[PDB]
């Protein structure tokens, strides 16, 4: 969610992700904590059995048949954390998230209430306006001629610089905005 | 600012036309394959894989998070069918053609058994209920001028 | 004038006053939910009086107060039927709504639109009262579609969540299919009986044909989520828990059953539709019960329980026991609303978690919720001298002793065992054992709103069966003579369900692991009905709607035949006519041709 | 009828002699006043129509249509003055003049006593509409749309002219009263078959009948907002009114000449409703919905029963109000984001709540929620069709479902979900837009209380 | 494994900025600067509406035929009519299977 | 070993069950890097306008415009009368019309000749 993805997953990343998925589905099957703990240790052991394999081909085939086993034996209804992409509360509070630019269309009578908040907002807007050009120039400096290669962004490097393209990351609404 | 050569055109047959088309849609020429050139009218537009929007990575940082789309990326011809309020093509635990067999078998078995139980009802070892006044002849619609046939019951 | 009519109409009238005050200053304050709750409680206590009048003298009435419009031989009037069904269902619904609104004042406290939520609940209650008291089919259709739209708006409460919008549109789609049959019934009744009111329909239909009854059956199947059109009720658990507790468990869902009960004089004259109703009900109760025993979400389990009980109501309509079916609707409201409120208190205490696999030992941590859910589970299973017992044990007795389809009877018994099993699963998983939830324990059920609402429905679930059963005239010739084994059939089946579910649940502590049976996968994925029926027809319809209707016909062939052909032909003829080289030799030569033709094929002809 | 007509004409020099900054105010005020005066034609005798004079008469069929026209003019003025702000004074006066001439032609057409005058005014409505579309249309495609709108209409209406003059030569009159009282059966001959077709096809293409409907998405989508409003609310109803009038001289031939048009209208009802499910343009969706509704009206008129005529009248009025409201709602968002694509702006309920309420109410009347008059008309037509044949319920039932589907689809796509992150120029709703929506909606709701007014002559 | 130097540094800078923004979303003690009977519910919500309805039913609705129809009251053997003072005789001397 | 999962149209093949992602060659990795680069260049172009302080309005997307144009206006220029196009057009265009004509004409003929026989149960049917 926060990190730039890479062009591909390594064998090691695939193996770790399969480890996590197998553990979570096993916990879904093994409801109770002790029984899950037992079978999770058995899983870790069966996983460690092929830990130090040097033949890449046989390691790949082990991973492949392990994925086939996981698919045949997965839980049809695994546990999902409530705010996770399948959870019962996944996007529950998206109707409460209002972008900050809406505050500029407020009537002056609405901004009469909350004077301090809006003064501090004018300060933030000044900051963004005075940082933008340095951000653009820095991004043009640090980027190869054939366009960027990944979605990674550089930090600030000078005295009063801000990390380029920061406004919509810093001014997110909230995750419980009301 | 979207000029004339930004727009879908006719089916490309020369490889240079295929290169221009793949670049116009922001694709690799190795990835870009148009629809077959029948007279359907698809033309220039690319034939993308037929996965749903539900199949995309929900943990990625999409420009349009609920649509799960990135700005400037080629859009599937059937996006509005796959918006994930709608047709889902996500892989299932049990195979299609196995879910179909089980569902059809369950329903056919239930219908067959209901027809059977219609042929072979359940009842109690009882005689038909008896009602006093010629089986309530005047009560169930009457016509009091036509002398019904005497329905008379006897004790037992 | 007799008080009976004034009070029955005032009961429904005062419910509209907080809606009128919606634009008023009270709405913008935090006093609005309490105000709506108080209004509903006053409406309940007022509706208690006509119930007393009926229970004393059997008073019934119809009120055609306002004439709306008249089409030549048909008169449409705002008319209210105030028979036994209306005066008995109004106080029950008002009581349940009062409890659920007091519960909502706590459950929905941090919602920023709690006032709108209360307004929406009230709108649903008004439309349900319209549905229930309607005397003609047009007013009943108004109430029908009104509760449909309030369901749509309340399921998609959190409108930023895509799954909520999907579930709301799904409810609308399934209901529309059901509506088709409703409209068919209306059209038949007008072109054959020349009326839409119940009175004229009863007089003129002594031998009711198949078509209007099959329309009514399609409508009831849609509204009550029967096996063809069932999947929308479990997916309607997307809405907030109070919506589920009132709209989808005890009140709106029984409308299809109530529609079939309103027309029982016509259905008792047709054995084919009775067989169809009984069979549809039997499959639905068994199937829903089967799906429920493997679900891990608590709201899904209770929703499948609701679908199963609706199927039972349909089977008791099928054996020609309309009054018995109505009694169950009243009985089931109490304890099913209470079950949903208990699940909601659990969910809120455990940080909005609904999976029972993360609910541990709450039997001690939530003592009052545990007591209430146990009593509701015992009422659901037909424990003797409880609200569930009068309604369900009589239904099983009547299904055992009637000339009925044998398969329907067997499925009903298996479903009666399934009910015990799912109830056992919830209690064993959610209240017994060791905690399985995160370590920051926020469990707290010490709020007077929650306690008072649940205690009110608890007293209901304990005593309402006895009181109601003893305070109404007998409309049913009671089964007094049956074999002892048959008499104990409901009890024997329930104990079997108890024991076997408890055995298979106790065997999950063992440190032994096996992969799932194919019957398990069938039960858990809901018979694969949503996996197939929600993908195949939708894909094919949307695909043909773009490829054939839109593109092949509008954009191509209808263009080709009329306008493009005209353009092409006129363009060709213009090019042929106008492209002359301007040489007089050629023009003059043609003039000679023309002159020769006229003096031969025109001058020789006179 | 002169009392309604002269003031409408007066509106013309009143707007040509007004100050540059008062044209909208003056036109709106006096349009509303004219609408109020017209409201007095709803008093109907019962047995017969009100015959003001030899040239004009009003009916119970006619009265609802006239009130809707006069009421639609001020709404069109409110909807226009936003996107016409940059325009010169003379061109603004010309636009208002086009709208006034259109209203004048429409009022006369509905009340003309005889067919030749009806034909002339019914055809005169083409010129201002074409000028509005092609001169003030936003897109390049407007020119093509104008040609489609003109040619489809004239190809139907010229055979009608020939048929009408022939009928007056054989009968001696085209006055509608004489036409009705001296009606005689149409024999079953090739001559009579082609007379029937020439009397029917113009009104069929105006409705539009499915398969002759291709002009409507073009013209309704490429027009400015007021052009679209008047094209959907009133101009489609010329076909229905004309057909209801003309089918009195066509019996008993209609009994079997109606079969292909009934088949086209029922199946194309299903077709256009399905098309609405896969539409990327928001105006295109509202246009096809109009087509689906008018197919229902065509069925009602072809089966020729009192219940079907009542349902057709009610559905015409209700559609006119609802379709205009939906077009105005779409235009507000278009004004914000300058694109017609439906998925461009999403989650607008978070940014504009009262406009979301207007959206919900318009979508609820579009799917004919009881007891709205949309459902009154649809239910009456469905009952008449059931009497005509019990198998029509399958088609009617299917249509009801697809309509609910695409109506709520439009609502959910535009109002729900999350807002597009990039668009930040969505300003609060203006008082003008909210008042325009309310002035569409309040009259529809008010009509439910007194259903008989929009029911028609058969009532 | 883990972040790169630039990744960690940028996350730290963005973190400081975001925490300052969240801190400054707080309200000061004055922010919402706003510019300048016991039985009353049962009488306006129950008593007034029942006055209007009972008036409406008693003098308007029941001023027309067949608008309020009550199913006729049950009569039993041994009952006494109120209007005529009739007495319906009792019911035929049961066989008395006590 | 275990029963196999076979994909279909409406339930596709999972990525971990795809033999293609376990048979990797250097050309595959170069293709993946090219795709990532294209995604990256597009992302930067979008974020430079998204974060711009002076930018007010709706960022215009040429991919969306291409989609709507291809779905509406580019369809007829790319149409050819083909055996497939013609047969499908005839079928989906006039088939249903004649089907429904046959159904309704048959039903109404039955009903009318039934009325001529004096046999329909039309009592109480005043409204039509
Ligand atoms: C007298 C009769 C008494 C016997 C009645 C049933 C006895 C117990 C049932 C199974 C027990 C068992 O041994 O479990 C093993 C195994 C358990 O699964 P698992 O692998 O342990 O689960 C994985 C985890 O444990 C998953 O763990 P979990 O956490 O998900 O827990 C699962 C959950 C749920 O448990 C399950 O996962 C299993 C669910 C399937 C079993 C459902 C039982 C009811 C079946 C009704 C079928 C009606 C007809 C359907 C016809 C369909 C035809 C296609 O456990 C529970 O909470 C309790 C479940 C219910 C237990 C109590 C059942 C009581 C009702 C049945 C007895 C009724 C007695 C009174 C009869 C009154 C009339 C005389 O399931 C089986 O092997 C038995 C399946 C039998 C299915 C038969 C369905 C009937 C029709 C068959 C076809 C007929 C025609 C031929 C085919 C067509 C040819 C053309
Ligand atoms: C049935 C209840 C009876 C209540 C008695 C008093 C009713 C007076 C209302 C008069 C008409 C309403 C005007 C409609 C435009 C809304 C204006 C507005 O913007 O609100 C701003 C205002 C200020 O709120 P805010 O805090 O600033 O923020 C508002 C936000 O925009 C968002 O705030 P929001 O989310 O709360 O949305 C506002 C609201 C407003 O949106 C609406 O959709 C309201 C209109 C209902 C649907 C319209 C089309 C459906 C076809 C039905 C046609 C019936 C018309 C009958 C004649 C009416 C004469 C005008 O939306 C809804 O609440 C959901 C609507 C779903 C209604 C489904 C009911 C189906 C039929 C029910 C029975 C109809 C026949 C009655 C007799 C039957 C036999 C006894 O909000 C309100 O005042 C709420 C409106 C009250 C809800 C009325 C719903 C039922 C009334 C239907 C017609 C009345 C019949 C009276 C006859 C006696 C019975
Ligand atoms: C895409 C949308 C376009 C708009 C739709 C327009 C619909 C127009 C269709 C007209 C409806 C029917 C027309 C005439 C009714 C019957 C037609 C004929 O086939 O019936 C038989 C007629 O017999 C034969 O069929 C003769 C007609 C065959 C020649 C016509 C060619 C039809 C081919 C289809 C071409 C498509 C026409 C539309 C162009 C777009 C009846 O037998 P008969 O009792 O003896 O004749 C009755 C007339 N009498 C009494 C004077 C004797
Ligand atoms: C009788 C007349 C009508 C009969 C039915 C004809 C076929 C109807 C086909 C409907 C086509 C509609 C296409 C557009 C729908 C919009 C897209 C859509 O809804 O997506 C599917 C959407 C999302 O899927 P979920 O699983 O809920 O997602 C959860 C996880 N995200 O789910 C749905 O709403 C699909 C609903 C389709 C229903 C089709 C099956 C119904 C069959 C009924 C036959 C039996 C009738 C009952 C008989 C009762 C006894 C008399
Ligand atoms: C309010 C506060 C003031 C209280 C003082 C009023 C006291 C009672 C006075 C009653 C009004 C006078 C009166 O009775 O006139 C009768 C007059 C017309 O006579 P009707 O037979 O009812 O119908 C006309 C066709 N014949 O009726 C009235 O106007 C008063 C009663 C109207 C009731 C309110 C309307 C309720 C229904 C609203 C419409 C709902 C949509 C349509 C649903 C259709 C369902 C089939
Ligand atoms: C935007 C597309 C709309 C297309 C509409 C086209 C169809 C219009 C209907 C037919 C048009 C011509 C009808 C003629 C006008 C009626 C006049 C009349 O009734 O006179 C008839 C004459 O009837 C004719 O002559 C008509 C013959 C047809 C000539 C023109 C053919 C044009 C194409 C005909 C088929 C198309 C009509 C339906 C197409 C609908 C659009 C798809 C009888 O008079 P007598 O000559 O005296 O006969 C008795 C004394 N012996």
Q: Which residue, F7, D6, C194, D269, is CA-closest to A71?
A: F7
Ligand 1 centre to CA of C406 (Å) is 20
Q: Do residues D68 and D26 make contact, with C-beta atoms less than 8 angstroms apart?
A: no
Distances, alpha carbon C437 to alpha carbons A87, C300, C349, C443, in Å: 16, 19, 11, 11
Distance CA D397, CA C187 (A): 12
The torsion angles phi and psi of B35, rounded to 5 degrees, stand at: -65, 155
Q: Which residue, C508, F66, C68, D298, is CA-closest to B76?
A: F66
D343, B63: Cβ pair inside 8 Å?
no
- Report residue A145 as tokens: 């001629």
- What is the three-class DSSP state of C319? coil
F26: left (phi over 0), alpha (psi -120 to 50) or beta: alpha
- Report residue D413 as tokens: 């796509």
- What is the three-class DSSP state of B26? coil
C401, B124: Cβ pair inside 8 Å?
yes
Distance CA C28, CA C342 (A): 30
C9, E70: Cβ pair inside 8 Å?
no
Distance CA C349, CA B108 (A): 45
Helices (H), C366-509: 367-380, 387-400, 406-431, 448-470, 484-487, 489-506
Distance CA D291, CA D298 (A): 10
Distances, alpha carbon A10 to alpha carbons A13, A19, A60, F25, in Å: 5, 14, 11, 13
Helices (H), C438-488: 448-470, 484-487
Q: Do residues D110 and D320 make contact, with C-beta atoms less than 8 angstroms apart?
A: no
- Report residue D304 as tokens: 């020729």
Q: Which residue, D377, D368, D370, is CA-closest to D312?
A: D377
- Report residue D69 as tokens: 């026209």
Q: Which residue, D81, D105, D75, is CA-closest to D93?
A: D81
Element holding C594 (H helix, E strand): helix C584-601
Q: Do residues B5 and F32 make contact, with C-beta atoms less than 8 angstroms apart?
A: no
Distance CA A130, CA A147 (A): 26
Q: How far is CA A46 from the centre of its chain?
A: 30
Burial of B129 (0-12, 13-18, 19+ CB in 10 A): exposed
Distance CA D43, CA D452 (A): 11
C509, A35: Cβ pair inside 8 Å?
yes
User: What residues of C are in contact with residue D279 (Cβ under 8 Å)?
Assistant: 550
Burial of B75 (0-12, 13-18, 19+ CB in 10 A): buried
DSSP assignment of C108-170: TTT-TTHHHHHHHHHHHHHHHHHHHHBSBHHHHHHHHHHHHHHHHHHHT-STT-HHHHHHHHH
- Report residue C260 as tokens: 């079939």
Element holding C271 (H helix, E strand): helix C271-292
- What is the three-class DSSP state of C233? helix
Q: Which residue, D22, D19, D64, D16, is CA-closest to D44?
A: D64
Burial of D192 (0-12, 13-18, 19+ CB in 10 A): middle
B4, B70, B72, B85: best to mutate for the D interface, most D CBs within 10 A: B85
D365 lines ligand 2 (CB under 6 A): yes
Sheet with strand E68-70: strands edge to edge: C74-81, C61-71, E68-70
For chain C, the straight-line distance linking the first and the last C-alpha, in angstroms and rounded, comes to: 97
Q: Do residues D183 and D252 make contact, with C-beta atoms less than 8 angstroms apart?
A: no
Distance CA B14, CA B33 (A): 13
- Cis upstream peptide for D208 (omega within 30°): yes
Q: Do residues C18 and C40 make contact, with C-beta atoms less than 8 angstroms apart?
A: no
Distance CA C1, CA E50 (A): 13
> Nearest-CA distance from D333 to chain A in Å?
16
The torsion angles phi and psi of C483, rounded to 5 degrees, stand at: -65, 150
The torsion angles phi and psi of F60, rounded to 5 degrees, stand at: -90, 135
Element holding C532 (H helix, E strand): helix C529-533
Helices (H), E1-98: 5-24, 41-42, 48-59
- Report residue D442 as tokens: 């309040």
> Each residue of A108-120: b (16+ CB within 10 Å) or e?
eeeeeebeebbeb
Angle at the Cα of C228 from the Cα atoms of C226 and C231, rounded to 5 degrees: 75
User: What residues of A are in contact with residue D419 (Cβ under 8 Å)?
Assistant: 99
Residues in chain B: 156
C141, D405: Cβ pair inside 8 Å?
no
Q: Which residue, A16, A68, A72, is CA-closest to A47?
A: A16
Q: Do residues D131 and D116 make contact, with C-beta atoms less than 8 angstroms apart?
A: no
Q: Do residues D223 and D231 make contact, with C-beta atoms less than 8 angstroms apart?
A: yes
Angle between helices D89-111 and D23-38 (to 10 degrees): 10
Distance CA F119, CA C35 (A): 62
The residues that bridge with D56 in the sheet, in sequence order, are D112
How was this entry determined?
cryo-EM
Distance CA C326, CA C312 (A): 11
Residues in chain C: 606
- Report residue D88 as tokens: 């010169």
Distance CA D298, CA C482 (A): 62
From the CA atom positions of chain C, what is the Rg in Å?
31
Question: Within chain E, how many helices (H) and strands (E) appear?
Answer: 3, 1
Q: Do residues C223 and C179 make contact, with C-beta atoms less than 8 angstroms apart?
A: no
Report DSSP state, residue C237: G
Ligand 6 centre to CA of D198 (Å) is 6
Which residues touch C45 (CB under 8 Å, ≥6 apart)? none
Distance CA D96, CA D92 (A): 6
Which residues touch E98 (CB under 8 Å, ≥6 apart)? none
Report DSSP state, residue C70: E
The residues that bridge with D175 in the sheet, in sequence order, are D114
E49, C5: Cβ pair inside 8 Å?
no
- What is the three-class DSSP state of C422? helix
Q: Which residue, D338, F99, D271, D154, is CA-closest to C555?
A: D271
User: What residues of A are in contact with residue D427 (Cβ under 8 Å)?
Assistant: 105
Q: Which residue, D286, D428, D240, D433, is CA-closest to D348?
A: D428
Place of tokens 């409530």: A82
User: What residues of F are in contact with residue A139 (Cβ under 8 Å)?
Assistant: 44, 48
- What is the three-class DSSP state of B46? strand
Distance CA B110, CA D314 (A): 47
Q: Do residues C248 and C333 make contact, with C-beta atoms less than 8 angstroms apart?
A: no
The bridge status of strand E68-70 relative to strand C74-81 is: unpaired
In this structure, the dihedral spanned by the alpha carbons of residues A117, A119, A123 and A124, taken in order and rounded to 10 degrees, is 30
Q: Do residues D137 and D84 make contact, with C-beta atoms less than 8 angstroms apart?
A: no
Q: Do residues E89 and E77 make contact, with C-beta atoms less than 8 angstroms apart?
A: yes
Three-state helix/strand/coil letters over chain D: CHHHHHHHHHHHHHHHCCCCCCHHHHHHHHHHHHHHHHHHHHCCCCCCCECCCCCECECCCHHHHHHHHHHHHHHHHHHHCCCCCCCCHHHHHHHHHHHHHHHHHHHHHHHECEHHHHHHHHHHCHHHHHHHHHHHCCCCCHHHHHHHHHHHHHHHHHHHHHHHHHHHHHHCCCEHHHHHHCCCCCCCCHHHHHHHHHHHHHHHHHCCCCCCCCHHHHHHHHCCHHHHHHHHHHHCHHHHHHHHHHCCCCCCCHHHHCHHHHHHHHHHHHHHHHHHHCCCEHHHHHHHHHHHHHHHHHHHHHHCCHHHHHHHHHHHHHHHHHHHHHHHHHHHHHHHHCCCECCCCCCHHHHCHHHHHHHHHHHHHHCCCCCCHHHHHHHHHHHHHHHHCCCHHHHHHHHHHHHHHHHHHHHHHHHCCCCCCCCCCCCCCCHHHHHHHHHHHHHHHHHHHCCHHHHCCCC
For chain E, the straight-line distance linking the first and the last C-alpha, in angstroms and rounded, comes to: 96
D348, D350, D415, D428: best to mutate for the A interface, most A CBs within 10 A: D350
Q: Do residues D162 and D225 make contact, with C-beta atoms less than 8 angstroms apart?
A: no
Distance CA C323, CA C71 (A): 35
Which residues touch F13 (CB under 8 Å, ≥6 apart)? B91, F5, F7
Contacts 24+ apart (CB under 8 A), C392-395: C392/C312, C392/C328, C392/C331, C392/C490, C393/C490, C394/C324, C394/C327, C395/C312, C395/C315, C395/C316, C395/C321, C395/C324, C395/C325, C395/C328
Q: Do residues E61 and C65 make contact, with C-beta atoms less than 8 angstroms apart?
A: yes
Distances, alpha carbon C583 to alpha carbons C580, C591, C592, in Å: 8, 13, 15
Q: Do residues C178 and C222 make contact, with C-beta atoms less than 8 angstroms apart?
A: yes
The torsion angles phi and psi of C217, rounded to 5 degrees, stand at: -70, -40
Q: Tell me which of D191, D239, D246, D260 to substitute to probe ligand 6's pocket, judged by most ligand atoms within 8 Å of the beta carbon.
A: D191
Burial of C118 (0-12, 13-18, 19+ CB in 10 A): buried
Distance CA D282, CA D335 (A): 13
The bridge status of strand C61-71 relative to strand C74-81 is: antiparallel
C489 lines ligand 1 (CB under 6 A): no
Angle at the Cα of E36 from the Cα atoms of E32 and E40, rounded to 5 degrees: 100
Distances, alpha carbon C247 to alpha carbons C149, C343, C545, in Å: 12, 15, 34
C19 lines ligand 2 (CB under 6 A): yes
């Amino acid at each position: 969610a926060f990190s730039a993805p890479a062009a591909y997953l390594t064998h090691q990343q695939k193996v770790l992700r399969l480890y996590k998925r197998a553990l979570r589905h096993l916990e879904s099957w093994c409801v109770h904590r002790d029984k899950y703990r037992y079978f999770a240790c058995l899983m870790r052991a069966r996983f460690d059995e092929h830990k130090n394999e040097k033949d890449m081909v046989k390691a790949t085939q082990l991973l492949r048949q392990a994925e086939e086993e996981f698919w045949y034996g997965q839980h049809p209804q695994p546990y999902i954390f409530p705010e996770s992409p399948g959870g019962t509360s996944y996007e529950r509070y998206e109707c409460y998230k209002v972008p900050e630019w809406c505050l500029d269309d407020w009537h002056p009578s609405e901004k009469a209430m909350y004077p301090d908040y809006f003064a501090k907002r004018e300060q933030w807007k000044r900051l963004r306006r005075e940082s933008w050009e340095r951000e653009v120039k820095q991004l043009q400096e640090e980027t190869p001629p054939g366009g960027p290669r990944t979605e990674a962004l550089p930090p600030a490097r000078k005295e009063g610089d801000l990390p380029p393209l920061w406004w919509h990351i810093v001014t997110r609404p909230r995750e419980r905005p009301m | 600012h979207v000029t004339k050569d930004m727009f879908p055109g006719p089916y490309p047959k020369t490889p240079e036309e295929r290169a221009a088309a793949a670049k116009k849609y922001n694709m690799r020429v190795e990835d870009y394959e148009p629809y077959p050139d029948d007279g359907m009218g698809y033309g220039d537009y690319p034939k993308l894989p037929d996965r749903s929007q539900q199949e995309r990575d929900p943990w990625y940082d999409w420009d349009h998070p609920d649509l799960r789309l990135n700005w400037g990326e080629p859009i599937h011809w059937d996006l509005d069918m796959y918006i994930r309020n709608r047709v889902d093509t996500s892989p299932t635990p049990v195979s299609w053609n196995t879910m179909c067999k089980h569902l059809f078998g369950f329903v056919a078995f239930m219908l067959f058994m209901f027809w059977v139980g219609e042929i072979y009802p359940s009842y109690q070892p009882v005689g038909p209920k008896q009602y006093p006044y010629n089986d309530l002849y005047l009560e169930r619609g009457g016509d009091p001028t036509k002398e019904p046939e005497p329905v008379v019951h006897y004790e037992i | 004038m007799n008080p009976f009519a004034s009070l029955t109409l005032t009961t429904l009238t005062i419910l509209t006053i907080p809606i009128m005050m919606s634009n008023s200053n009270i709405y913008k304050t935090n006093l609005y939910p309490n105000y709506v709750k108080t209004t509903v409680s006053y409406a309940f206590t007022l509706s208690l009086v006509p119930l007393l009048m009926f229970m004393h003298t059997g008073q019934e009435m119809i009120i055609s107060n306002w004439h709306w419009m008249t089409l030549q031989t048909v008169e449409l009037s705002l008319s209210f039927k105030m028979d036994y069904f209306s005066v008995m269902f109004i106080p029950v619904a008002l009581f349940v709504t009062w409890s659920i609104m007091e519960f909502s004042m706590w459950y929905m406290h941090s919602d920023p639109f709690i006032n709108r939520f209360f307004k929406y609940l009230l709108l649903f209650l008004i439309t349900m009262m319209i549905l229930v008291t309607a005397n003609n089919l047009f007013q009943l259709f108004i109430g029908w579609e009104g509760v449909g739209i309030m369901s749509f708006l309340l399921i998609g409460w959190w409108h930023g969540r895509t799954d909520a919008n999907t579930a709301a549109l799904q409810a609308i789609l399934y209901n529309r299919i059901g509506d088709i049959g409703f409209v068919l019934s209306m059209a038949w009744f007008l072109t054959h009986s020349n009326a839409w009111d119940l009175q004229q329909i009863f007089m003129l239909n002594n031998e009711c044909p198949n078509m209007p009854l099959i329309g009514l059956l399609l409508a009831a199947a849609g509204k009550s989520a029967q096996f063809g059109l069932h999947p929308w009720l479990p997916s309607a658990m997307e809405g907030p828990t109070p919506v589920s507790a009132l709209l989808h468990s005890s009140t709106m869902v029984v409308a299809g059953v109530f529609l079939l009960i309103r027309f029982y004089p016509l259905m008792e004259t047709n054995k084919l539709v009775q067989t169809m109703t009984l069979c549809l009900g039997a499959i639905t109760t068994l199937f829903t019960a089967l799906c429920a025993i493997t679900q891990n979400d608590i709201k899904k389990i209770v929703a499948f329980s609701t679908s199963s009980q609706l199927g039972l109501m349909m089977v008791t309509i099928g054996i020609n026991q309309p009054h018995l079916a109505f009694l169950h609707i009243c009985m089931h409201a109490f304890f099913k609303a209470m079950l949903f409120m208990c699940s909601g208190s659990i969910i809120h205490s455990l940080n909005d978690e609904q999976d029972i696999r993360k609910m541990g030992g709450l039997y001690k941590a939530m003592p009052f919720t545990t007591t209430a859910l146990i009593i509701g589970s015992l009422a659901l299973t037909g424990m003797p001298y409880l609200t569930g017992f009068y309604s369900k044990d009589l239904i099983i007795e009547a299904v055992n002793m009637s000339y009925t389809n044998a398969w329907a009877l067997l499925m009903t018994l298996i479903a009666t065992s399934l009910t015990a099993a799912y109830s056992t699963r919830i209690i064993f998983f959610a209240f017994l054992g060791k905690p399985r939830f995160p370590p920051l324990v926020l469990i707290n059920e010490n709020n007077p709103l929650l306690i008072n609402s649940i205690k009110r429905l608890l007293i209901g679930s304990i005593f309402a069966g006895f009181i109601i059963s003893n305070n109404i005239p007998p409309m049913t010739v009671p089964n007094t003579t049956m074999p002892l084994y048959m008499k104990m059939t409901a009890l024997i089946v329930t104990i079997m369900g108890f024991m076997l579910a408890l055995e298979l649940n106790n065997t999950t502590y063992y440190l032994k692991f096996k992969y799932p049976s194919q019957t398990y996968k069938f039960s858990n994925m809901l018979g694969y009905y949503p996996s197939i029926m929600h993908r195949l027809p939708t894909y094919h319809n949307l695909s043909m709607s773009q490829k054939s209707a839109s593109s092949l016909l509008d954009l191509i062939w209808l263009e080709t035949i009329l306008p493009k052909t005209t353009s092409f032909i006129q363009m060709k003829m213009s090019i042929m006519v106008s492209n002359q080289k301007g040489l007089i030799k050629l023009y003059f030569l043609s003039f000679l041709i023309t002159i020769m033709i006229s003096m031969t094929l025109f001058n020789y002809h006179e | 009828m002169l009392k309604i007509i002269i003031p409408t004409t007066m509106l013309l020099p009143m707007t040509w002699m007004s100050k540059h900054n008062m044209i909208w105010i003056n036109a709106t005020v006096h349009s509303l006043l004219i609408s109020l005066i017209s409201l007095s034609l709803l008093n109907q005798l019962g047995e017969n129509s009100l015959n003001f004079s030899l040239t004009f008469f009003s009916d119970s069929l006619s009265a609802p249509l006239l009130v809707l026209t006069t009421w639609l003019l001020p709404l069109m003025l409110m909807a226009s003055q936003s996107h016409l702000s940059k325009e010169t004074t003379t061109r603004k006066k010309l636009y208002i003049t086009m709208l006034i001439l259109l209203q004048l032609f429409l009022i006369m057409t509905f009340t003309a006593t005889e067919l030749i005058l009806f034909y002339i005014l019914f055809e005169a409505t083409l010129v201002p509409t074409l000028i509005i579309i092609t001169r003030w249309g936003n897109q390049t495609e407007r020119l093509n749309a104008g040609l489609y709108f003109l040619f489809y209409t004239l190809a139907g209406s010229l055979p009608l002219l020939v048929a009408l003059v022939y009928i007056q030569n054989t009968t001696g009159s085209l006055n509608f009263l004489i036409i009705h009282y001296w009606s005689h059966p149409l024999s079953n001959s090739w001559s009579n078959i082609f007379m029937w077709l020439a009397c029917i096809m113009a009104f069929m293409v105006k409705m539009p009948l499915y398969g002759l409907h291709l002009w409507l998405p073009k013209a309704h989508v490429e027009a400015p907002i007021a052009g679209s409003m008047v094209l959907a609310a009133v101009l489609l109803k010329l076909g229905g009114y004309g057909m209801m009038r003309i089918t009195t001289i066509l019996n008993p031939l209609t009994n079997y000449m109606a079969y292909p048009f009934l088949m086209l209208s029922m199946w194309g009802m299903i077709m256009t409703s399905s098309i609405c499910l896969r539409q990327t343009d928001l105006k295109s969706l509202i246009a096809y919905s109009s087509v689906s509704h008018m197919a229902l009206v065509i069925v009602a008129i072809m089966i020729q029963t009192p219940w079907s005529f009542m349902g057709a009248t009610a559905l015409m009025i209700a559609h006119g109000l609802t379709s205009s409201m939906l077009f105005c709602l779409a235009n507000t968002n278009y004004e914000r984001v300058h694109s017609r694509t439906m998925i461009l702006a999403r989650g607008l309920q978070t940014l504009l709540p009262l406009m979301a309420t207007w959206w919900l109410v318009a979508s609820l009347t579009n799917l004919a929620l009881p007891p709205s008059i949309n459902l009154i008309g649809e239910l009456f037509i469905i009952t008449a069709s059931f009497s005509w044949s019990n198998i029509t319920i399958i088609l009617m039932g299917m249509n009801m479902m697809i309509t609910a589907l695409y109506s709520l689809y439009m609502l959910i796509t535009t109002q729900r979900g999350k807002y597009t992150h990039h668009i930040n120029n969505i300003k609060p709703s203006f008082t003008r837009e909210n008042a325009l929506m309310a002035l569409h909606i309040l009259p529809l709701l008010l009509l439910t209380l007194n259903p008989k007014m929009i029911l028609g002559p058969l009532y | 494994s883990g972040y790169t130097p630039d990744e960690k540094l940028r996350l730290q800078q963005l973190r400081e900025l975001r925490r300052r923004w969240l801190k400054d979303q707080e309200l000061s003690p004055r922010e919402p600067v706003l510019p300048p009977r016991h039985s009353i519910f049962a009488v306006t919500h129950v008593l007034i509406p029942v006055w209007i309805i009972h008036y409406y039913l008693k003098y308007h609705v029941t001023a027309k035929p067949y608008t309020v129809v009550e199913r006729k009251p049950r009569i039993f053997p041994g009952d006494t009519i109120l209007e005529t003072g009739e007495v319906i005789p009792l019911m035929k001397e049961f066989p008395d299977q006590h | 070993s275990f029963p196999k999962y076979k994909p279909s149209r409406l339930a596709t093949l999972p990525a971990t069950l795809d033999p293609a992602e376990y048979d990797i060659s250097p050309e595959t990795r170069k293709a993946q890097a090219e795709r990532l680069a294209i995604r990256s260049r597009l992302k930067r172009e979008y974020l430079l306008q998204y974060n711009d302080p002076n930018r007010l309005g709706v960022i215009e997307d040429p991919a969306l415009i291409r989609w709507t144009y291809a779905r509406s206006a580019n369809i007829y220029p790319n149409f050819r009368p083909t055996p497939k196009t013609s047969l499908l057009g005839a079928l989906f265009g006039i088939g249903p019309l004649f089907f429904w004509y046959y159904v309704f004409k048959t039903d109404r003929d039955k009903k009318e000749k039934l009325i001529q026989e004096g046999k329909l149960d039309q009592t109480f049917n005043i409204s039509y």
